[PDB]
Design an enzyme around this catalytic site. Structure first.
Site, PDB file in Angstrom:
ATOM      1  N   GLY A 256     117.238  46.215 107.860  1.00 21.98           N
ATOM      2  CA  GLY A 256     117.617  45.722 106.546  1.00 21.98           C
ATOM      3  C   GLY A 256     116.728  44.563 106.141  1.00 21.98           C
TER       4      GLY A 256
ATOM      5  N   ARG B 256     117.830  54.107 110.877  1.00 25.35           N
ATOM      6  CA  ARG B 256     118.260  52.772 110.572  1.00 25.35           C
ATOM      7  C   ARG B 256     118.617  52.085 111.889  1.00 25.35           C
ATOM      8  NH1 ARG B 256     118.922  49.369 107.018  1.00 25.35           N
ATOM      9  NH2 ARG B 256     120.374  47.624 107.460  1.00 25.35           N
TER      10      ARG B 256
ATOM     11  N   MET C 130     126.791  48.268 106.142  1.00 22.35           N
ATOM     12  CA  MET C 130     126.772  48.416 104.676  1.00 22.35           C
ATOM     13  C   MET C 130     125.908  49.521 104.116  1.00 22.35           C
ATOM     14  SD  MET C 130     126.859  44.279 103.456  1.00 22.35           S
ATOM     15  CE  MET C 130     127.208  44.902 101.614  1.00 22.35           C
TER      16      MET C 130
ATOM     17  N   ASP D 123     128.600  40.842 116.191  1.00 19.58           N
ATOM     18  CA  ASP D 123     129.832  40.100 115.944  1.00 19.58           C
ATOM     19  C   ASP D 123     131.049  40.954 116.238  1.00 19.58           C
ATOM     20  OD1 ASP D 123     127.647  39.160 113.902  1.00 19.58           O
ATOM     21  OD2 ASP D 123     129.024  37.452 114.085  1.00 19.58           O
TER      22      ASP D 123
END
Ligand code: MG
Ligand code: MG
Lengths: 231, 231, 231, 231, 231, 231
Positions: free
Chosen positions: A19, A86, A179, A203
């Site tokens: 990203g 990704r 996302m 996280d």
């Protein structure tokens, strides 16, 4: 080609999609041989190099389905990319996951209107290309990496109105939240190309745990290796 | 239970889920040792026998998410079932698939309101247990079977109002249509058990081609063998 | 033809539609003269006999709108059925109703997506044929049976995620819950044929009360007599 | 109280609900004994008189579910009305219906969001009180009036964006279009009171036919007589 | 403050929000006195300087509601921004607009699920702060700039599946299409701060016209002046 | 037309649209020179007179989007109306507003299905004509009137099922509730005419405070004066 200005041929058929454009810079400089910057438009760095004889590109996508979708559309339709992986971080939403675990997204749930609009309220399941999913899994296994294969949630909303927004998803087995994957998986199917999303748990949204900068880089490096070997 | 009348103990933890109770009878009599009927309520035959010394059950589910969901709920919640494999037929919606191909459902799209209601209009992707998906794929490969892993559409509606109802699904990579997988995958996640849906292409909905009775039996048997080796 | 294998004149224009094929058997053997089986596919028994000199059929439907819809479509479109009467049990959701009350469904609410899809989110009210509603009511009246005419809810979901799923429906006058009436009433309208759903209250979902097997039979037989006199 | 300014006993428990306050005036003056005006707010005339010794009221409602709903709420909740009968005109959407036919609405379809909001997208069927439906039908029958009992569509939109807005409704058996019945039937259920909507076909939306003013009056008077004999 | 790493106090209460971080660089270097770079995370440049004695910041937001929303949330909640003015380009969807026209967004339509989720399918109109809208208009007027005040459409989708995707919006008066304003306007209201979106027509999606690089810079410079004077 | 029976020519291009026909009468008799009634159908009074030598009409609309939409459609399409200003009362949903404040509706949120249906679930923002908004604002300012420009909510439902229905709207900056603005704004855009909705706060829905009859009249007159000067 409004958002990527490069000559045709500058982008390899196989491409990693972090990203952060600075993460793309990091990947190109550390993992690729003879990396060449082909894009600077909007500071959205894109590079092309080689990995063990294979031509590979790495291109920043921005955050969220609308941004990532612009780059993915252009990469596939204008530059002829065929294999899109990704690589990213995600927040775990079940205690079955631990910090630093690798998640390979079998499918991607979403709260985006992308497919509600396309399918008039019917439910489309955006999915990974099985061949990529399988080989990525085999790569993680051979390294003894804690790896899970299953659902993720692609959200439009980093900052939800209310607390505990992911409880129901977790109750139905969803592993982690990011996302973009739902957009990548839907667009890959739309264009008949191959895609995969691999994630590291940076996280833990349940335990409140966070990875140290040293931890992140170590497991991140491993993920990139897996992706590059798979691609 | 209201729809399965057997005691706890009669039903095994691993269970094959055909739709037709007469297919349950067929599977039990031809593939299991010492099959014994445990259910006759609504003529919805269920059997338990052994395969290579381990107990395996076989239970008819009826047609559609509402019927199958009743049996799946009762099997998991009242009978302790942990591994649920649907075996069935499906209609191919892409020319990429041929009659007699095996499809292993990585996920299941749907037109059912099941998850729209549960997730207040957001999009949940009902998925297979990866470990079962992987093992079934390897089983099919080892027999040289033409096999595809990907999306199926679970429909509520066998007879649509207009022609060409599946074209948009096909454009987004959906392989085949059946009526239950989305239910099975959602309930398995709900209860934290394993599930997989394996399908043979008996009808091609694009070409209009159809398998002979002899053809159906041959590939069906092979699919059952794959399923039993996947447990 | 794919789910009923009988020649084109084997089924009568008037047909009783219990859900359980074993109830179809019971009805045929106990209320019809010269009952003859015409279907065994999927153990979904269907029979044709006479009642007071006129042909009547009785066909099992399976559970839920997707299953029942398959049978109804085939019966109307292939077999020329014109008068379709569902006889079943239902769960009362209001203390205004008592165990063993008869409910004649004037319309059927639903949580199914069947009409949301058809009408693009507008609200269609699936309704009984008034002539049949009126005749059945008069029949129940003539027998001094406790009878109510009103709304039912046809649900996809026998086992809801949370407790008290039916409270809001009851606040808006809904009498009882079953799983098929909305599909029956919609398809009867689609094909311009006549339909009615008659129900006996076997379980009270508010008080937890349940009928004994002897009570179920006595009231069930009464409902069948009413249905036969209505066609 | 905010839209009807009359003391608490001024309105009868049985009430006729035309839309046009000038029709309320007409009904009061021509069919009631000792009619007395009780409301003038917003020119929304309401009257109370007697019919065969029993008190009956007649109240203008205005057009559409939002307007009618305000009056119905106040009538039931503040004035204690128990039996509410809408008398109106409607546009036929099927050639099965002729100008001047009476339609008694067994239920009311809608394009209003009122129940989509209330039921979170599930489908609620707003229905007539069966006892009133049955009594009105018998009344129309006794007079040899051409009468149909079935579905109407209550629309928010008198003037649609595109031509042929009602075709799909008609294909599914809907008889005629008006603007209030769905609201009336929903609120009657909300408050546990009895309601019916009776309609005269004044316009044929398929054939373009329209009734003359003399024809409107003759059939309208007949409908009013039926309504008065039903309460 | 994950996405903007700056000390508290580094960002002014008044902030311009271009999408492109390089456009932020351009604004800071050409319009601001003593510009200071406070953010480099993800190459998303943010600067703080002064304009005619007023402290003003300029911060890149990325493309689409999900990306812009992250920055807006952080700017308002963590950095205490109070006046947010998005400055951008848009594609005109009506011939009433000409290339180089200025559009000030009175409201923002959207295809994003952002508010469908928040308001459970009800319709929320994201709006500009009137005071800002008014003063921006006065500023454009005093310069004799062709300016329109009205609706824009904030889309998730730069590349639509089908051609002519904006025809219906244009028929209902929508002026132009961009990707963020609905998110900005909704978040501003959520946090009770003030916001405005100003746009220059760089492309005409009806006539196929495009602005030259010289034209863009000239009208762009003017827009920035307007925003800075308004803020 | 069906709901307004006057000839073309009787109705002026500029028109005030109160909801109550008796308010139309009041406005005509007290603010216009030579007012003459042009409509009595359904007691929905419409008048035409002059203001400072120019023709202005005043027409009752009834309550709710469905009723108002009928009149607005007919006024624009059959009577040639070009400038439509609604004047009315509203209930404040925020303590930021006080009784007797003027609200000028910059846009109108809604719970009506009007646009959900038109835009297939996407979000359209019904907006005022900016030029009218600006002029009305300047008029109110010039009289030292407390005035707010912003969002209102047009509801279908005057009497909600549960308490506190407006709190979420208020949290997102919505000022006041009425029942028609969203309809007026959408239809004005549909037809390419001008519209504005001006409102006085007669009731506070948070504080429960309410204006006296004397207070209502005084601020209502002022609002009418503002409206007439805005033409
Ligand atoms: Mg083995
Ligand atoms: Mg003037």
């Amino acid at each position: 080609t409004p958002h990527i200005s490069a000559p045709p041929g500058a982008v390899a058929e196989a491409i990693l999609l972090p990203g952060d454009p600075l993460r793309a810079k990091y990947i190109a400089e550390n993992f690729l041989e003879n990396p060449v910057l082909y894009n600077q438009v909007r500071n959205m760095f894109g590079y092309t190099g080689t990995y063990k004889g294979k031509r590979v590109s790495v291109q920043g996508t921005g955050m969220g389905i609308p941004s990532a979708s612009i780059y993915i559309h252009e990469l596939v339709q204008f530059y002829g990319c065929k294999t899109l992986i990704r690589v990213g971080t995600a927040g775990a939403i079940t205690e079955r996951l631990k910090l630093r675990d690798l998640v390979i997204a079998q499918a991607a749930c979403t709260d985006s209107s992308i497919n509600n609009l396309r399918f008039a309220g019917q439910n489309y399941a955006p999915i990974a290309t099985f061949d990529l999913l399988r080989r990525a899994y085999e790569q993680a296994q051979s390294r003894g990496m804690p790896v899970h294969v299953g659902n993720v949630l692609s959200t439009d909303t980093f900052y939800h109105d209310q607390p505990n927004p992911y409880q129901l998803w977790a109750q139905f087995g969803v592993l982690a939240v990011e996302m973009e994957a739902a957009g990548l998986y839907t667009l890959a199917a739309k264009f008949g190309v191959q895609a995969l999303c691999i994630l590291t748990i940076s996280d833990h949204l349940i335990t409140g745990e966070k990875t140290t900068p040293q931890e992140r880089q170590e497991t991140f490096d491993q993920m990139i290796e897996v992706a590059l070997e798979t691609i």
